[PDB]
């Protein structure tokens, strides 16, 4: 499934992933209510749920 970033995020641990408002990444799991794994640039981690919308 493919999500919308809404806003820009910075990674700030080595589990988090960085990602630019407007960007589309695909979503790899979506099980905590507040971090959700995705994919941007290449990379595979976390970013917060709230940043993101669903497609």
Do not use: C, M, R
């Given at each position: 499934?493919?999500?919308?970033?809404?806003?820009?995020?910075?990674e700030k641990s080595p589990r988090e992933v960085t990602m630019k408002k407007g960007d589309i990444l695909t979503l790899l799991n979506s099980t905590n209510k507040d971090?959700?794994?995705?994919?941007?640039?290449?990379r595979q981690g976390f970013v917060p749920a709230a940043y993101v919308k669903k497609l």
């Open positions: 499934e493919l999500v919308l970033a809404l806003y820009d995020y910075q971090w959700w794994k995705v994919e941007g640039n290449g």
